[PDB]
Design a protein around this ligand. Structure first.
Ligand SMILES: CS(=O)(=O)NC(=O)[C@@]1(F)CN(c2ncnc3[nH]c4cc(F)ccc4c23)CC12CCC2
Length: 167
């Protein structure tokens, strides 16, 4: 039993809700919240900009030190950093950005990072400003992640479309 509330169950291990991931994180305080990161951990907009703002920019300060030490992430890769006031940990995961010409096949590699964590609150990778089809992203999530994933979908219209079209 865990504290996630109001989710629709899609499969044995994948759950979905219409929710603001920032507000969901602040309430649940999950062990892991997933950030829709880029390779530079520049949290300017989308989910990343919203998560960072909610930490009062502490996420960005920590991220800049991480990059200065380690260099950029790989597309499809991840790193574990602090969850600040939102979660114990933040798993920064880089899905491919279609608006940058990145290979969509890397979306499966991106979701594989979730399997290193027993339970996660996450957005749909490569959705939103990353330019991928969220329905596809949901399919890859279901077919790749084996650990327990709670997907927060900000847009109500999109959430209803994801549920209604789910095979
Ligand atoms: C409109 S969207 O639904 O298409 N979402 C997108 O475009 C995104 F940019 C933003 N994302 C979020 N996901 C869950 N909670 C969220 N709270 C937020 C609060 C914000 F001020 C901004 C973004 C989010 C957000 C997902 C996304 C796809 C990959 C990044």
């Amino acid at each position: 039993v865990n504290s996630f509330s109001g989710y629709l169950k899609l499969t044995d291990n994948v759950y979905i809700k219409n929710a603001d991931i920032v507000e969901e994180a602040k309430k649940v305080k999950p062990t892991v919240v997933v950030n829709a990161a880029n390779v530079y951990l520049k949290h300017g907009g989308g989910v990343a900009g919203a998560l960072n703002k909610a930490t009062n920019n502490a996420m960005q300060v920590e991220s800049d030190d991480y990059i200065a030490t380690n260099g950029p992430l790989k597309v499809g890769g991840s790193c574990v950093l602090s969850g600040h006031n939102l979660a114990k940990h933040c798993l920064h995961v880089v899905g491919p950005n279609v608006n940058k010409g990145e290979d969509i096949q890397l979306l499966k590699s991106a979701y594989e990072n979730f399997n290193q964590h027993e339970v996660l609150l996450a957005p749909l990778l490569s959705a939103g400003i990353f330019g991928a089809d969220p329905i596809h992203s949901l399919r890859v999530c279901v077919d790749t992640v084996r650990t327990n994933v709670y997907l927060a979908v900000f847009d109500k219209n999109l959430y209803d479309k994801l549920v209604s079209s789910f095979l």
